[PDB]
Design a protein around this nucleic acid. Sequence first.
DNA 1: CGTGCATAGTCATTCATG
DNA 2: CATGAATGACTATGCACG
Lengths: 214, 217, 471, 471
Amino acid sequence: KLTPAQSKNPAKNELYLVEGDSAGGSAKQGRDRKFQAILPLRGKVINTAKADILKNEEINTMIYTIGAGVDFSIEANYDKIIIMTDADTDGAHIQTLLLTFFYRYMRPLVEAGHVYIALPPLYKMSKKKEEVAYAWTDGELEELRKQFATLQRYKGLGEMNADQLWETTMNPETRTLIRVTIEDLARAERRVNVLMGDKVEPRRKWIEDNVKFT
Amino acid sequence: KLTPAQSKNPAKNELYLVEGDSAGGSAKQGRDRKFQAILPLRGKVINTAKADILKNEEINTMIYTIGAGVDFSIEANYDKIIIMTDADTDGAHIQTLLLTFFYRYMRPLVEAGHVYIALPPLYKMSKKKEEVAYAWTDGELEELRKQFGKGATLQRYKGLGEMNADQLWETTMNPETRTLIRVTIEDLARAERRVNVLMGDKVEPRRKWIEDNVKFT
Amino acid sequence: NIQNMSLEDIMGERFGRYSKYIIQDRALPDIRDGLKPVQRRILYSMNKDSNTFDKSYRKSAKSVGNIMGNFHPHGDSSIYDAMVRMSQNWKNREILVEMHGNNGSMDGDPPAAMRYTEARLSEIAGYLLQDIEKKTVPFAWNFDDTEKEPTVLPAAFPNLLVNGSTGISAGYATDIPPHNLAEVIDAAVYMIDHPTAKIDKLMEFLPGPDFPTGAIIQGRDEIKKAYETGKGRVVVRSKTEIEKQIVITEIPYEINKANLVKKIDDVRVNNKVAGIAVRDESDRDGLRIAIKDANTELVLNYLFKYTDLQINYNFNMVAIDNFTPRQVGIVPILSSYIAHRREVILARSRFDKEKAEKRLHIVEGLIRVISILDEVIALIRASENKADAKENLKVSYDFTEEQAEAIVTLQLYRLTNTDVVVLQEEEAELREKIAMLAAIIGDERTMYNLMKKELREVKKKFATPRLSSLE
Amino acid sequence: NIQNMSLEDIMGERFGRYSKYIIQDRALPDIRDGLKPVQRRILYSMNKDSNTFDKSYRKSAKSVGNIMGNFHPHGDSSIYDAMVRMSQNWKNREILVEMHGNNGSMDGDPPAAMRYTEARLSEIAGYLLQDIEKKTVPFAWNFDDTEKEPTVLPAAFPNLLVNGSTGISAGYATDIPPHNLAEVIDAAVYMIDHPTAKIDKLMEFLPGPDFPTGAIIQGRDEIKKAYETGKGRVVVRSKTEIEKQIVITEIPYEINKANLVKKIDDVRVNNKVAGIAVRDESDRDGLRIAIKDANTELVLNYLFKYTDLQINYNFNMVAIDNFTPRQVGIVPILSSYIAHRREVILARSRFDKEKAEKRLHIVEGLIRVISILDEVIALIRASENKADAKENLKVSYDFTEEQAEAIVTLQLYRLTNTDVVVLQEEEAELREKIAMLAAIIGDERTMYNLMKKELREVKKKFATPRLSSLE
DNA sequence: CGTGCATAGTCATTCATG
DNA sequence: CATGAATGACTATGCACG
Ligand SMILES: [Mg+2]
Ligand SMILES: [Mg+2]
């Protein structure tokens, strides 16, 4: 069940999709309830690219709370659906999974420019007087360490506080978002079908030829 | 769901009621599957002395797996229903709760001599050559400690799932060396009176019972 | 083999065991540190693992596992959930744990799983533990006989009244309202001087509960009854402002802002009352709830009756004294707390005095050696073993045993510093400390005075304005 | 501010990250210690906390919390469940954890919750860790930068083949059959001498999988293919006895005795085959399953086809070498393991040699002092500070820095023992050790020989008969 | 379908009291 | 039906592969 915003205005209200209840808590807490609504998912999301689907509570709810429908049709219900997942690597997998759902079904939504990815910190480093930085992946860390310490790593959103989540990754004044647009369809289909697809034979080759195991 | 014995013989087969799946595991493992069947309950049991009842999965299952029924009628299904709970104090509460269910509903079962309580160790103490003892409550412990003097190691079973197969059998299931409790009722009046206070719904008296009877030393 | 027992008797033993454990060991707070055991075990274990306010935070789950493993044979959840309450500013007045991350709120949202959060002991928390390490309080074994646990805490401040506590066991249940640390201590001190104290005067100091959620409390009469008998009923009303609109900026303790709001709006849709026109706009730093015919007073006055914008709070002040359930008032709680601090103080001193006397006797020894130094070393050289060394010193210069280990184990750069003046300084210091201590230990007024000082020194540091108001 | 990214590209980064972590950090075993990371972190953490086979058992939940807190940012369950596998004799060949209590079984019953069980590291487990504490292996930081973790273990024995491993990640999955520790090592040693070794000869040593559940394995041809390529299919048949009745006393690895039995009886009720007449009577110490027209051979032969009394086992031997997924055969696995042990050996020695050289230089120093002793102490006395003391020794008798701390910090009973003979003894000892070591470090054959010895010394201790048979 | 590591949740029951 | 410590459990997902 969802924690919706006060005003019901499809022109400037955002839907925040979260990895679960624990994370969702911090979400609801640090947030401008005027135009920010928050919807938790139970962990990893059904691979929509692999009837099984619509019967899965987690997908069904997303559909209902958004309006539109799977066909689709648009303007309901928010001019932003933002995917906010843990900052770790499992987060990226959930991002991956959610996106192929939107791309597969809600395509125009994606084609439009209404699917966003939110980029919350992974590491926070600190040295009355305090100096603090944020890192988003291992690479970022080394330079931060060289600069500075105590290092904190958010094993999930529920681990940072209200003030932080807002100031870093929700407040539009100082936040930064990613906007997901598609610039082919052919390239898109080709890619999603390999990675998220069902065949594996190629997925492997894709890793082999493309995953730098340094 | 239950782990029933091989032979289906209501003359010498026992039903072992357990506090949960984890405990139930050790139960099933150390056991003579010829005539020992094992049925887990999900923790604390509905106070039957306080329609709500029959609708509670845990009670409903007990009824079905035993035969008889709530009325009652008898010989199904085992000539022993044995209550085997963790050896700690929460165990005694579950014993308390299960018994008032039997006493309240399955009364003849109780009146007969077919309700048993099993008494599994709480503490095991140890000093190629090993010396080992078992204790059943705090009192028992002091003498055990004095005996073992220095060097002892004391183990406390925070639940049945914590001892092994060999142990549970050798100590508290194998009829040759085990010891059981048989629950019989020698009034009805006294029984009702007591169960209604302790397990009852009034509290006003339960308190006084504690005050006047619980030695808080 | 089978033992034949009745139903009546078996039911007796089995219930009697559980009834006891439940009362003491689970639900009911000790009247001295006003703590249930989980709480105590969390504090002790955390602090033992030095997880303190000054040093970094520590992954709650590690914390939980350590407690479970060492002290507390129960569910992770039972422990961690309790740990989380202690991190709840709207629940506890003076918080004994600081947690970083999502630990629920007033909207009732559920705390983030333990694998997420991180926690440490708060500042005032330490004062509960203070002087623990100086044999100030009775220890017992853990369940495994593997390590020893405190049965109560020293308790630098009167935690019980301060943070209240509730409260459900066999035959007994308890609810105790939080109180204003400053005010509480005031009362404590006064009683320390005038023990034969009447409630009416104590009331002048501790005037009634301080809720962490502010709010308005009305019912001096019943409050007194509560403080006298241990049971009472009080009225609590949310704090109302009128804007030109009803602005709510405080609600009653133990009440759920979220549902509270729905219940209000349910009033509107059910149109049960007149001018009903209801929005919640509260954010990280302030509580705000917003509510033609401005029958406003009727709407507000109705709200109080028909909803939880105004409730009553009930006093059932039940703690464990002498290992047993007691329903008590302010006077018992205060008195007993005081008497505790006495044992603690005296035990502290007794242990400190001995610690003193040993280094004093050892210092006295080094001083003597400084004068025989040349010959002493000469002896050690001519000695065969470390032990032979010691034994020869005991035989010749008849030093004691402990003095021997001390002189022998002395490193070498320590010889760089032969200077009886410094040792003498320390000796003077010790003698002053000991004779001072021996006073507290046998001077009963001198003792109670130290109790007074420490209490004031605490009242100062952790003092905080009232948050709840009395009408 | 908003960065505009495509779908194709975003999908790329995000998948590429996960694909990698999953392959290395989660599922796939290192080819050197044949361990997935959870496993490694459990062993390391346990052993670090010294939870070893020789000392008492320790509440699993404490164990789990400590791992989670220090090393492993994940679910309790993920960790503990893995910990429990390592305690499963029917799953692992040579078990790396001993657990006390209910840890499931072959009937598939579920392991008792962690708050129940207790665990320690097994005996052979230590050999995986052996020499860890002597800088033998690359360490990294933990997630928090709070403490360092090993990236692989020393690995006294070839864990990978021994205990097998499976096996599911992005693009890659793995299954590796357990093997007979004795036989494995035999192969290892042989390769050490004749590196250019052909499989056929290696096969003479490692002839094929050893399952912990015994059973019968048939398919030499395909086995070789597995050992050569890394993929193969084998047949596994339960071990059958005929009593005058079918007696089953071994079933195929990774197979569920409980369901296996129901599937057999389902055959009878479905009366799918002729003489079907099925009971399970197995107890703590032995597996036994019991099964007119004694078309027995037809019944048995049918059972094999239509049920899991005989299955096939599949080889997909995929490990991480060079930080990457590789499907490899016996030769790669063995070779790489060997080469590892080399780095370990050389690193061990390098560290030992330095440790030696320091105490040697320090000993050499004490020896000199024994001859100047009277004057040395005299200096120390005439010295001002501890440091002034040191600095004066460095100036006069030009001792070194470290020699100074050593002579100064010397306690006093140590003067009781002025006896250059003993020091000389130790010196002789050190010199012998160092020059021996320096050999291994620059003698490549000398090195491989030590590898051979240690491996034999292990094969001896942990050796065990075959349990699976080959047809 | 299960296998092994991961993601993230939920349910019954007790006890006193308004 | 909450409230706070307890007893004791369960469910959905990805991923490769037979
Ligand atoms: Mg996450
Ligand atoms: Mg139990």
